[PDB]
Amino acid sequence: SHPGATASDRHKVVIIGSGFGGLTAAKTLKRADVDVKLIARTTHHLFQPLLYQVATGIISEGEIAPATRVILRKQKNAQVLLGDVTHIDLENKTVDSVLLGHTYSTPYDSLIIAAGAGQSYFGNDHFAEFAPGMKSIDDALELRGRILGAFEQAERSSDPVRRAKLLTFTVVGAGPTGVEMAGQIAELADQTLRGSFRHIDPTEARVILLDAAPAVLPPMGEKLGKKARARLEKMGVEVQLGAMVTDVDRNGITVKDSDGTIRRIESACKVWSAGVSASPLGKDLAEQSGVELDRAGRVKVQPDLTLPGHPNVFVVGDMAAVEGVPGVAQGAIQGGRYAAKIIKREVSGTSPKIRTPFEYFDKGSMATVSRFSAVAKVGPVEFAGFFAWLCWLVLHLVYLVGFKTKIVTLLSWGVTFLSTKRGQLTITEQQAYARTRIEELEE
Amino acid sequence: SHPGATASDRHKVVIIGSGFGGLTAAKTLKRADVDVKLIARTTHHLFQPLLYQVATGIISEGEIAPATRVILRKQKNAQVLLGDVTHIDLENKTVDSVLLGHTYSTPYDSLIIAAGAGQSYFGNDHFAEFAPGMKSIDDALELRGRILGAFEQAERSSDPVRRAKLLTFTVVGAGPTGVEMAGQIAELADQTLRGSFRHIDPTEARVILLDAAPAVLPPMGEKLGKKARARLEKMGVEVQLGAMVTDVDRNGITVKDSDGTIRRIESACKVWSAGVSASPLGKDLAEQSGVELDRAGRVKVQPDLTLPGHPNVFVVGDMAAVEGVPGVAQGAIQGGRYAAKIIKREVSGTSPKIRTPFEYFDKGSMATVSRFSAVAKVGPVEFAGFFAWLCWLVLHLVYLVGFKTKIVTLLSWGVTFLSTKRGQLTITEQQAYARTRIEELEE
Numbered sequence A, B: 001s002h003p004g005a006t007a008s009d010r011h012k013v014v015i016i017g018s019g020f021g022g023l024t025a026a027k028t029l030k031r032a033d034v035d036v037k038l039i040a041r042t043t044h045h046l047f048q049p050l051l052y053q054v055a056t057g058i059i060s061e062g063e064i065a066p067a068t069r070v071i072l073r074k075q076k077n078a079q080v081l082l083g084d085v086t087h088i089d090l091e092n093k094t095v096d097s098v099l100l101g102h103t104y105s106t107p108y109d110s111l112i113i114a115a116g117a118g119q120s121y122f123g124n125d126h127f128a129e130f131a132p133g134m135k136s137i138d139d140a141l142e143l144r145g146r147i148l149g150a151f152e153q154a155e156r157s158s159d160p161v162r163r164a165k166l167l168t169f170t171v172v173g174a175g176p177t178g179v180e181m182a183g184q185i186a187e188l189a190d191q192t193l194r195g196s197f198r199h200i201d202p203t204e205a206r207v208i209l210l211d212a213a214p215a216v217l218p219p220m221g222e223k224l225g226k227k228a229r230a231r232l233e234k235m236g237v238e239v240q241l242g243a244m245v246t247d248v249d250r251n252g253i254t255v256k257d258s259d260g261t262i263r264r265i266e267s268a269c270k271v272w273s274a275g276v277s278a279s280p281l282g283k284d285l286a287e288q289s290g291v292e293l294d295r296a297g298r299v300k301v302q303p304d305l306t307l308p309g310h311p312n313v314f315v316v317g318d319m320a321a322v323e324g325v326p327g328v329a330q331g332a333i334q335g336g337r338y339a340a341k342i343i344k345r346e347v348s349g350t351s352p353k354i355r356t357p358f359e360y361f362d363k364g365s366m367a368t369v370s371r372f373s374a375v376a377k378v379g380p381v382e383f384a385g386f387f388a389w390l391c392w393l394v395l396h397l398v399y400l401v402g403f404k405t406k407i408v409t410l411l412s413w414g415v416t417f418l419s420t421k422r423g424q425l426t427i428t429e430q431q432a433y434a435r436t437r438i439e440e441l442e443e
């Protein structure tokens, strides 16, 4: 019923989600002759690459989660809206969303859908009670809560087996996020806490990195994978590969490896970085358009990112199963910019008879292992180590919104890498447990 | 029951609370021939004076809330412990505390009880779900959530009555915390949000400051209070005085004026800051020592801050009632330092035969009204305005732990006072509502 947005007499663009793709399309429409609505679940534009830093106390929330209203402040075309999209209608041309129990059904003339993707438990979906996967500010603070709270519990225990259980951290998945987390948790336990405890030595903590994949960083090949693994192993991370999780609980994890030697890992704190799963909005799209979903539910968009039959509805970023395009920032940014350019060209009436296919311009990739250690690959060139870690820090630091935010980031890196001192090192029990306990109570 | 700490043959000092008093006693014992055990509900040392700034997005946690365990890193005889004190035994000489379902029974030879005092609802405790308190990082993040989320709900709402209800913020109590909160919420809606919204104008936000007291900042007297009120009214805050709350609900507040006429404030977001209420530990002391409690439950400690009949058990800081001594930082700091020096002498010998009474050396007070405006009083002088606000900023800034933290604070003040924008404007519905919904579900 309620449109939940300002009225319009121009071509109406509705953008779903406010991460990279959606925000890039919004910025790209800044002087197009269209009215833009941007509907997203959260006020902030989460700079997910650095999420492991706030998850490990290097950086604050406001360095990585700028308010979208401040970014689009001057863009008179664009109204930002809070809300969770409940449903999308391809025939009535409405987006149906909820906010604190109020329902809004915003009309559109074209869509950019950038709802993205998150981790996947491969159907063992109840594991989310015991092993969160970050990918949001809430989940990153929940992880920071657990990873410090384990040491705080570990001092107050006469039981050595309980201490061993608390001081063993398990990271599942050897994708970029898993190597990042196992790296920072190992640094945190080795160097930041080194003198701050008196019943235990945090340097005796174990960090275990589990994946069923045969190699670390599958998309970067054998050389960079082996070098990253050797760096993690030199840091003392126990890298276990070819081990598939069979069960997860509050006390530990059971894994079965390729030889079938079922075993258990006792481990209080567990991080689930593995897999991918697209936004459920793909289901409503599949039902209305008949578009295919791949495994993990990504929409098999047409060569112009449209749905079959409903042109000028675009799916972009990690929600789209574009052929060969990796699930990385520059893919969302290019997809959103492409869709935006299409809409601008059509509204101005300069549309060609056929839209040229989307071409992903591959601008390379990078992953951090730890302080002074990253890996990179640019076309035929592969490099690793300090020069890489510099080329990562510089690349991300270029993107952070606002000059102050960059400066305070650079100060926080300065101290955290040159000295054994994290900022932001505050647990709150509310944030460490609210999600799991409310899940336990919502019955 | 478990001794939740390492044993020792030394004289054993237990300290309760990471706040000013207890941490100052801990730091004061750095060379005493005692082993110190500091039990606190949370890891951080919460610098509450600035808590309104994080509650209004100027600054982050971990800048305001250093980890106590890191502050004492070098103090080889002091062991920090996480936990909530459940009970204290004056005859068995144990402190009994719980952490995540485990229970501990730490013995003490001397005790520094320095747990805080919070707000009070004067027995209308069923207000707490509708008017959150303050005095924790979680309360500050909750208020930041409900504040910005009111504007977020306000843009989508079609009904003018509902927009008016959402855009009216009510602050209860005109102590320092109330004047701070009404000030920042008014300036934030007048400046930081100005023009960031298109269905609404944030400069139409209505901020109401309620107290039943007859004057603003009553402990500074009329000459400062009238100037502070005139500054609040010049910013357009509606100061209402002599109005006592009769009921509070999710939609508004009903108040009775001093004329006895009854009237209602329709207001979505409510901040509670009136009154004071000591932490319940005073009750167990009152039942064991028989010490009197004031109307706020504060312990009427003896002239040496001891409990009657239990020497070298000290109640100190805001939990302690001492005549004249106000509930402010320097009082907790001076008390804790006094009690620590008593312990140090008694253990080292060459103590006087009778302890000299505690004398509060009054080092003045001051309160912020808003940007470029504060009120102060030092003995006979009563300076106010920009020169005050500078004194405020420089004073507090002196205390923040670690030089980096000061620098990044000063940068955040720089940007947010010289320009409209704010750094930490990040919120989540978990942060805004987790306690509300879990309490609604814990029955």
Ligand SMILES: Cc1cc2nc3c(=O)[nH]c(=O)nc-3n(C[C@H](O)[C@H](O)[C@H](O)COP(=O)(O)OP(=O)(O)OC[C@H]3O[C@@H](n4cnc5c(N)ncnc54)[C@H](O)[C@@H]3O)c2cc1C
Pocket: A016, A017, A018, A019, A020, A021, A022, A039, A040, A041, A042, A044, A046, A048, A049, A050, A051, A052, A083, A084, A085, A086, A114, A115, A116, A117, A134, A135, A176, A177, A279, A316, A317, A318, A319, A327, A328, A329, A330, A332, A333, A366
């Ligand atoms: C820990 C981590 C580290 C990463 N590091 C890197 C890296 O270093 N480099 C890299 O290239 N990629 C990295 N990625 C992946 C990268 O973030 C994604 O490939 C890409 O950013 C996808 O973003 P997007 O633009 O598709 O939207 P996303 O940023 O994924 O989010 C889409 C938006 O939609 C919103 N939304 C979700 N559901 C709804 C709904 N129902 N209704 C409305 N709005 C909704 C979300 O809140 C969000 O604002 C990382 C991912 C993670 C989890």
Ligand SMILES: Cc1cc2nc3c(=O)[nH]c(=O)nc-3n(C[C@H](O)[C@H](O)[C@H](O)COP(=O)(O)OP(=O)(O)OC[C@H]3O[C@@H](n4cnc5c(N)ncnc54)[C@H](O)[C@@H]3O)c2cc1C
Pocket: B016, B017, B018, B019, B020, B021, B022, B039, B040, B041, B042, B044, B045, B046, B048, B049, B051, B052, B083, B084, B085, B086, B114, B115, B116, B117, B134, B135, B176, B177, B279, B316, B317, B318, B319, B327, B328, B329, B330, B332, B333, B366, B367
């Ligand atoms: C909103 C606000 C504004 C303020 N403004 C000013 C100001 O302008 N100027 C000024 O000088 N002072 C100000 N203060 C300081 C405050 O008013 C007190 O005067 C002062 O902080 C006293 O603190 P404390 O040292 O007694 O311990 P607190 O900091 O009050 O807390 C004691 C410690 O005990 C812990 N604790 C609590 N319960 C338990 C338990 N059951 N078991 C174990 N540990 C427990 C708490 O977590 C905390 O770490 C302000 C405080 C607040 C909340």
Ligand SMILES: O=C(CSc1nc(=O)c2ccccc2[nH]1)NC1CCCCC1
Pocket: A049, A329, A330, A333, A363, A364, A365, A366, A376, A377, A378, A391, A392, A395, A396, A399
């Ligand atoms: O190969 C690359 C990686 S592009 C990239 N990465 C991101 O994390 C990112 C995050 C948000 C938005 C855009 C992003 N784009 N950069 C080259 C220079 C450095 C060495 C390798 C070659």
Ligand SMILES: O=C(CSc1nc(=O)c2ccccc2[nH]1)NC1CCCCC1
Pocket: B020, B049, B329, B330, B333, B363, B364, B365, B366, B376, B377, B378, B391, B395, B396, B399
């Ligand atoms: O009036 C004062 C206020 S003292 C003070 N305030 C705090 O907030 C505080 C917080 C934590 C620890 C100690 C603190 N101590 N100081 C005089 C000099 C400046 C001009 C006025 C007179």
